[PDB]
Amino acid sequence: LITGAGKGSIGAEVLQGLLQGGAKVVVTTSRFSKQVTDYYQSIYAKYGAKGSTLIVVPFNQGSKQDVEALIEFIYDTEKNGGLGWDLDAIIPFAAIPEQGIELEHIDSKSEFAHRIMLTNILRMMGCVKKQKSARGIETRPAQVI
Amino acid sequence: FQKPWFATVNGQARDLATMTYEEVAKRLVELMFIRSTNSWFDVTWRTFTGDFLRRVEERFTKSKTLSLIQSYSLLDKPDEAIEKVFNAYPAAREQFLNAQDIDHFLSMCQNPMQKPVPFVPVLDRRFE
Amino acid sequence: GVATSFSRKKARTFDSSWNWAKQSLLSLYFEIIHGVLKNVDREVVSEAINIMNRSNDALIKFMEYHISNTDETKGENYQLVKTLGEQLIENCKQVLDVDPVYKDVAKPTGPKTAIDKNGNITYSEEPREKVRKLSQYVQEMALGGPITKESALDKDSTKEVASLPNKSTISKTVSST
Amino acid sequence: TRGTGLMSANNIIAEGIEKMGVRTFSQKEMAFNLLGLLTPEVVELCQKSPVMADLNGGLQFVPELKEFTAKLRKELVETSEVRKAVSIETALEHKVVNGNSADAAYAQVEIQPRANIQLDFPELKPYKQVKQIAPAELEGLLDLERVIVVTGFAEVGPWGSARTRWEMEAFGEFSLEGCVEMAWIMGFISYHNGNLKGRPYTGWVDSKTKEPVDDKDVKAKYETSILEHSGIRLIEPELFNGYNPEKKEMIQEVIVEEDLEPFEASKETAEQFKHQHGDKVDIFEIPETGEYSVKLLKGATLYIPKALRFDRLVAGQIPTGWNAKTYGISDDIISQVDPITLFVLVSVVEAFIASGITDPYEMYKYVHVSEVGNCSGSGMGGVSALRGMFKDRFKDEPVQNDILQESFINTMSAWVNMLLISSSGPIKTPVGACATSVESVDIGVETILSGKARICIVGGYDDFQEEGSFEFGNMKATSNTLEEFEHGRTPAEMSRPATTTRNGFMEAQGAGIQIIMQADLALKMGVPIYGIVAMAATATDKIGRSVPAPGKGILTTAREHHSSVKYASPNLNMKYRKRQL
Amino acid sequence: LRAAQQQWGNDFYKRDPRIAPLRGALATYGLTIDDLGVASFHGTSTKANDKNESATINEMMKHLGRSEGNPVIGVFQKFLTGHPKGAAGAWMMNGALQILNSGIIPGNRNADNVDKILEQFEYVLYPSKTLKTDGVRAVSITSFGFGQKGGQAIVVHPDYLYGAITEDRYNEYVAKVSAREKSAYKFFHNGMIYNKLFVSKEHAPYTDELEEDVYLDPLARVSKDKKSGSLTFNSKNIQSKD
């Protein structure tokens, strides 16, 4: 599962590498649009090796409800409309840039950013631990990076 | 008459519409550039012929480029300037004049700030 | 900011590598034939790796047919494609039933800041002198620097393609260095 | 990590920080570093105990990194600013000493391109090159009166002409020529030749403001407008007589519970109200005027309008601004014929221009008037005239008396013969629904190979209207546009053939025409030849109860007996066939 | 002569049950089944149609023993235009002629992800981006209408015709064509700027007195009227000995 892997980011190059080596990846976008789904289609068609599979979902890592829903979607069975996956890695690289906000300026944007970059990363890990423990998966841990 | 039919290639009566861009620029030189004196009869006639060679480049170029005729001075050796223009743009040797370029040519033939051209370019209401 | 975006219905699934393999080959095959890619360009090796990582029987037949039916007498480009074509089929037969690999063969770049005589600041990425592969990049990393102290590519791609399936036996590790 | 170029992530000082024998990273290197942590060795390690990896490149051993990077920026900025101030002062000195007389010799005249729209005729090779591709035995083997060629084609559709559609199909972007043609079609630019706000101007002008427009500027001024108002896009009501699929007018029958207020109406209209309702109305003359008063009693039947919200909101419509007048179809024709006929009339002249035949009568220097056929056809025909005769006539709106004849599928081919061709050729109008255009070629081929004609117009046309949209939606043939928006799909990306998530077709409108001839006559007349029609078959399928189910009947075009194939038939070998000739 | 050329050049396969109508069609010009490069599929973006069509083309190619590893390159032009019903095949046919004469094969840019079901059809390839080939020799065009209408046209590259005439007849042709391309360009640009590409005829090429005479004479042809400059039938050239 990779967050923050938009175009011209470290995440995008990680993603090419994962597909190149046959990974099944869920990449999340914060700007879901035709320009984005065209981007990712062109990546997969260039790089996606045999047995690879890129799923691209809209997402707002700043939302608790999105975080729960996304992990619930990845782990729900194909019968219920999920992927019926079981994560081996999570690479939560989703950020928003804060510039020239020194201590006196910390306001809404910084408290929101803190939710994306910390609080909701703990909630993704929480959700992944609840889904794996629901199904009694004790020997296939997800490497958080 | 002293003002001949302009669109006459090798003595074959024709029409501006059914002349090539090469044929039009060679005919301008034939009618507006005196071989004995080896110069343009009027500077405004040279300007009329340069304008037309620029218009050729505009029609047959694919991208923004520098003109091959930077000063109309270069037309004081007209045969060279014509060969230089139609070698860059050899399509223009074969294509007939665009209808936009006919209209432009007949509109330069009516410029009040130039010596009247020494030829009838078209039979219409303005023939008199 | 906390407005939901996610919905299972907007999930887009890309999984048809079987079909994009053939397109990747055919794009390369006609790129080479029209001299868009030459025998020196790294892009020829990158595209090979990606074709090898999608190798199956249906792709090996697709390559065998197109390369066999190429007439090398029509042009130098047609000979270059046919030589590389044969090489790529040899690789794609070898790596059938082998796991696909991540292998970056892009030329490693370093920063260059240049100020001109008119004081315009331009930043480019230029190729490093010492490091022209990732193998060498990992060697440069293992050697550190003075501050960290405490108390076949670019010349012929067709031969560099023939070396892709061969898992190079590491004599002595970079960790020893 | 270094972002893209210049400003991002302080790239300008990266070379500077690297001069301490610290390393900075490309994204591709930092990606490779991080995938190092998904290798099985480091994964196995992560599972023993948590793994902290430093991919910092020694940047931790630089003391006061804030101060050190601020110093590097300030040592670049001072050096850039100095040289800028010295460059500004040598440019001013040079200005003063040389004025603008020795500075005017440097400036050169640029040539801005003008659209030069070619007709893209086929490139004929030298005979040596075109003798290579065919075997030598071919020469004098074929009867060229039995070889059908396509000599010209055109279409009116969602992306305008065949030239413009082809640009957007092959390259997904307009050329200069493509923009100008799409701007002219859509009516953004008209041509002007004359005096325009005094001085004389010969060229394109904005069709609204009459402001001059250069060819270079047409991409800058109108491409966004052209791309917005072409192709598969939200149904524009202005193009469909105010049809809005979000507000689709139906009428419910209601019984009057208590009497209405009397309204005024003419004698004839009141007698009509009386005839219909019988006892349930009262008509009374008003002696002052002679105009009657209609009074609907209790138990009378009325019709109250109600709007339905429909879920097909997107179609392949012809670019907004497209107008038959732009091609020069007179208002007397536009007011008479169905809108579909206007697409055919334009497609037919535009095909004749593609075939190098500007005056169709030229054909009759080479062939009899009985030898030019029209083998073209439609699926549903003039569906605006059907609406007219079934709905608008019911609602006693004003409709042309001859609306019936405009409705008929064979009436587009009538107008073509009546306005342009004036042949007495065969006229075989097929109706094949979505296979009408391939049936047209099948009939037009069979017509030439039979001697009944030597040229045929072929092809197909169909319009998009309210009733057909709705009915394709009740048959669930078309894509539900609400479901597409649920899945985050924009209009453009709703027609996605061969994909996992395809869910019905996108309705469109327009016409396509080809001109086909015998090859023998094409060579004689010297018309371009864009291809040979080698085959054209049709086929039904089998016993079933589903009319819209597609089947495998056309598989019969590849029927051959393979019991006895031990030795190749000599009849397939061209050397043999040429010998027997 | 013509009947012999027809018996051996054109219609050599009409009576032969060992040769397909689709094989004979190509074989006529010396093409084999492998030379069919591009299939312009109906490809409506419906579940039933797009599978059915792929399966149909696959089974044709397999029965006519097309080379393994040589799929037809499917072209789904309706990703861009949508489905105009009657006009569908006409648009396909125009894009087939534009594929042959350019050798560019357009890609389905909405082919996000090709249906897994279509992998079983090894004789079909579904590109998502435009290929500049060295050349396309023939193009199939398959349509499937409502009411069990199925169609197929084959269109062959027009260069396979010119190898069937003499160098003198070909060079005559090429001279005539160039003359006509120049006059057509002239007409096009003039009709574009003055909104007069379309010009309705006011009259038939014959008056009403000649109408029956022109119909009944098969060798009646038109000729420029010296006065009006228009192509008309002239009484003198109807039931003429000449």
Side-chain angles (χ1 to χ4, degrees), chain D residues 29 70 121 165 252 332 342 348 359 377 381 415 432 440 477 545:
Chain D
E29 284 152 346
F121 273 41
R165 189 255 308 142
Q252 190 173 359
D332 62 90
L342 292 183
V348 167
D359 180 357
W415 282 105
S440 173
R545 298 282 176 282

Side-chain angles (χ1 to χ4, degrees), chain C residues 12 113 119 125 128 137 140, chain D residues 2 12 15 18 33 80:
Chain C
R12 300 290 167 76
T113 321
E125 303 262 359
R128 302 187 164 283
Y137 162 81
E140 178 197 346
Chain D
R2 308 192 304 277
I12 59 165
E15 199 187 349
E18 273 200 3
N33 294 338
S80 166

Side-chain angles (χ1 to χ4, degrees), chain D residues 333-542:
Chain D
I333 293 159
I334 292 156
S335 63
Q336 170 69 45
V337 301
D338 211 75
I340 197 197
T341 302
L342 292 183
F343 306 153
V344 178
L345 288 174
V346 165
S347 297
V348 167
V349 306
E350 193 172 50
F352 276 118
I353 293 157
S355 143
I357 296 169
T358 73
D359 180 357
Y361 283 4
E362 189 205 337
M363 289 181 297
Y364 309 133
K365 290 160 68 209
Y366 304 100
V367 316
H368 188 40
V369 291
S370 78
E371 284 176 311
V372 175
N374 198 326
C375 305
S376 94
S378 184
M380 298 179 287
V383 291
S384 274
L386 287 178
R387 185 172 56 71
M389 88 164 63
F390 277 97
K391 181 152 149 211
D392 294 347
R393 191 77 86 189
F394 181 61
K395 314 207 268 184
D396 213 297
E397 300 188 6
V399 191
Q400 64 190 87
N401 289 321
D402 44 27
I403 198 67
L404 180 63
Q405 86 204 25
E406 302 321 309
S407 76
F408 294 142
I409 294 156
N410 66 290
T411 278
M412 291 56 88
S413 296
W415 282 105
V416 163
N417 201 30
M418 298 200 304
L419 282 166
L420 296 167
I421 311 313
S422 181
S423 67
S424 314
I427 176 79
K428 286 156 158 157
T429 317
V431 184
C434 324
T436 304
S437 285
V438 178
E439 179 172 323
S440 173
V441 171
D442 189 355
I443 284 158
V445 163
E446 188 252 355
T447 295
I448 290 157
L449 298 195
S450 82
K452 287 196 166 74
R454 296 172 62 203
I455 310 172
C456 256
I457 302 137
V458 296
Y461 31 88
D462 246 318
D463 214 327
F464 166 89
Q465 291 303 329
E466 169 167 351
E467 286 67 39
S469 188
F470 190 73
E471 279 308 328
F472 278 125
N474 303 326
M475 285 162 49
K476 296 183 179 294
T478 51
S479 55
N480 193 309
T481 309
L482 289 191
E483 297 176 34
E484 293 294 63
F485 292 150
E486 276 185 70
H487 296 80
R489 302 280 188 182
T490 65
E493 72 164 313
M494 276 172 202
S495 198
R496 49 174 179 283
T499 59
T500 306
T501 54
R502 69 193 187 283
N503 215 336
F505 72 79
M506 186 59 58
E507 201 167 332
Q509 43 162 353
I513 296 291
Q514 294 90 48
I515 317 297
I516 55 172
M517 314 197 166
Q518 293 167 339
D520 204 69
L521 167 65
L523 297 174
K524 191 163 69 164
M525 291 178 73
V527 294
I529 294 168
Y530 294 94
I532 294 168
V533 183
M535 192 193 77
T538 44
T540 55
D541 314 321
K542 54 170 176 172

Side-chain angles (χ1 to χ4, degrees), chain B residues 17-18 94-96 98-100 103, chain E residues 179 182-183 185-186 189-190 193-194:
Chain B
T18 73
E94 299 302 296
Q95 205 171 277
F96 292 156
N98 195 305
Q100 294 197 51
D103 278 357
Chain E
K182 276 194 280 286
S183 299
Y185 173 90
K186 182 182 80 175
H189 280 283
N190 181 76
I193 68 183
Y194 298 130

Side-chain angles (χ1 to χ4, degrees), chain D residues 187-402:
Chain D
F188 297 123
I189 64 176
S190 290
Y191 176 78
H192 186 272
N193 179 34
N195 286 307
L196 196 71
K197 279 76 72 174
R199 76 296 179 284
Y201 179 75
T202 295
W204 298 117
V205 303
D206 182 64
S207 297
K208 295 181 66 63
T209 69
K210 300 293 184 293
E211 191 61 37
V213 184
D214 297 330
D215 291 310
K216 61 168 283 279
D217 302 326
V218 167
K219 188 176 316 301
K221 284 186 196 295
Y222 306 112
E223 190 171 32
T224 288
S225 189
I226 290 162
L227 290 194
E228 194 153 1
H229 290 302
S230 314
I232 300 183
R233 70 183 189 286
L234 291 171
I235 289 154
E236 304 195 17
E238 299 66 42
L239 308 184
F240 305 110
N241 301 114
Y243 166 54
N244 168 13
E246 285 146 321
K247 197 178 202 228
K248 179 198 170 67
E249 197 196 27
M250 297 175 60
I251 57 188
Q252 190 173 359
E253 190 190 274
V254 305
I255 314 298
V256 175
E257 276 293 286
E258 188 72 359
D259 298 3
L260 273 77
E261 188 198 7
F263 59 97
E264 197 78 3
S266 93
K267 183 168 186 301
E268 292 300 295
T269 308
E271 289 306 327
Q272 271 162 40
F273 274 121
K274 188 65 201 167
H275 197 183
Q276 168 54 31
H277 289 287
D279 60 50
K280 298 299 186 313
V281 67
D282 269 339
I283 59 165
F284 296 125
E285 188 184 0
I286 296 160
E288 298 91 312
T289 57
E291 199 73 358
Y292 281 62
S293 83
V294 187
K295 165 58 172 52
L296 283 175
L297 303 184
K298 181 168 69 174
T301 300
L302 283 177
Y303 288 107
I304 300 163
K306 56 177 178 186
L308 181 56
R309 281 69 188 109
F310 193 48
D311 49 14
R312 274 70 176 173
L313 304 164
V314 174
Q317 309 146 79
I318 286 162
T320 312
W322 188 100
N323 184 11
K325 299 194 61 50
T326 304
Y327 294 94
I329 305 186
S330 63
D331 283 315
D332 62 90
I333 293 159
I334 292 156
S335 63
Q336 170 69 45
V337 301
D338 211 75
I340 197 197
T341 302
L342 292 183
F343 306 153
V344 178
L345 288 174
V346 165
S347 297
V348 167
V349 306
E350 193 172 50
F352 276 118
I353 293 157
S355 143
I357 296 169
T358 73
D359 180 357
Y361 283 4
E362 189 205 337
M363 289 181 297
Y364 309 133
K365 290 160 68 209
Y366 304 100
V367 316
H368 188 40
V369 291
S370 78
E371 284 176 311
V372 175
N374 198 326
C375 305
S376 94
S378 184
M380 298 179 287
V383 291
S384 274
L386 287 178
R387 185 172 56 71
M389 88 164 63
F390 277 97
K391 181 152 149 211
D392 294 347
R393 191 77 86 189
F394 181 61
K395 314 207 268 184
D396 213 297
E397 300 188 6
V399 191
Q400 64 190 87
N401 289 321
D402 44 27

Side-chain angles (χ1 to χ4, degrees), chain E residues 41-206:
Chain E
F41 282 27
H42 197 44
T44 46
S45 173
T46 84
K47 286 295 189 219
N49 185 90
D50 284 23
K51 182 221 164 62
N52 176 69
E53 177 163 37
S54 294
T56 310
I57 296 298
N58 188 88
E59 195 43 54
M60 276 169 189
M61 290 311 106
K62 194 145 65 70
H63 180 83
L64 301 184
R66 192 181 166 92
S67 309
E68 285 186 27
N70 187 20
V72 301
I73 296 163
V75 158
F76 299 81
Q77 187 198 48
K78 286 183 196 45
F79 83 93
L80 188 68
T81 63
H83 182 29
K85 293 88 68 197
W91 289 356
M92 280 157 74
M93 165 64 84
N94 291 350
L97 297 170
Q98 291 178 302
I99 284 154
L100 286 177
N101 296 293
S102 73
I104 303 173
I105 303 179
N108 181 3
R109 296 201 289 286
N110 290 355
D112 48 327
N113 177 59
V114 177
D115 188 311
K116 182 50 180 200
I117 300 308
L118 305 177
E119 187 190 64
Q120 72 183 287
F121 310 133
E122 72 276 32
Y123 284 100
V124 190
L125 172 61
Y126 306 94
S128 66
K129 64 181 204 288
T130 297
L131 307 166
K132 279 61 67 187
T133 67
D134 51 356
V136 172
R137 281 174 297 287
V139 174
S140 152
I141 295 151
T142 35
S143 278
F144 303 91
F146 291 14
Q148 308 207 307
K149 296 257 167 149
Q152 191 178 38
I154 305 300
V155 176
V156 165
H157 195 281
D159 284 344
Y160 287 89
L161 176 71
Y162 302 134
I165 58 165
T166 65
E167 198 251 31
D168 278 17
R169 196 183 178 183
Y170 179 70
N171 283 320
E172 171 168 42
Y173 172 64
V174 173
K176 286 217 59 165
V177 154
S178 293
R180 197 185 272 292
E181 189 279 319
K182 276 194 280 286
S183 299
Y185 173 90
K186 182 182 80 175
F187 180 88
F188 182 76
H189 280 283
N190 181 76
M192 184 175 167
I193 68 183
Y194 298 130
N195 302 116
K196 65 174 299 293
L197 285 169
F198 173 102
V199 167
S200 80
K201 297 308 206 149
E202 297 310 316
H203 304 106
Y206 42 82

Side-chain angles (χ1 to χ4, degrees), chain D residues 523-566:
Chain D
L523 297 174
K524 191 163 69 164
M525 291 178 73
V527 294
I529 294 168
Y530 294 94
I532 294 168
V533 183
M535 192 193 77
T538 44
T540 55
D541 314 321
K542 54 170 176 172
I543 294 305
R545 298 282 176 282
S546 181
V547 170
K552 289 210 146 51
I554 205 59
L555 198 48
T556 56
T557 67
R559 66 187 179 285
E560 41 184 47
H561 204 254
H562 287 161
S563 87
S564 47
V565 287
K566 73 195 193 197

Side-chain angles (χ1 to χ4, degrees), chain A residues 67 90 120-130 144:
Chain A
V67 164
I90 301 166
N120 280 354
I121 287 174
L122 294 176
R123 287 200 183 109
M124 260 186 276
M125 296 180 60
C127 285
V128 165
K129 145 73 196 175
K130 286 200 218 76
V144 179

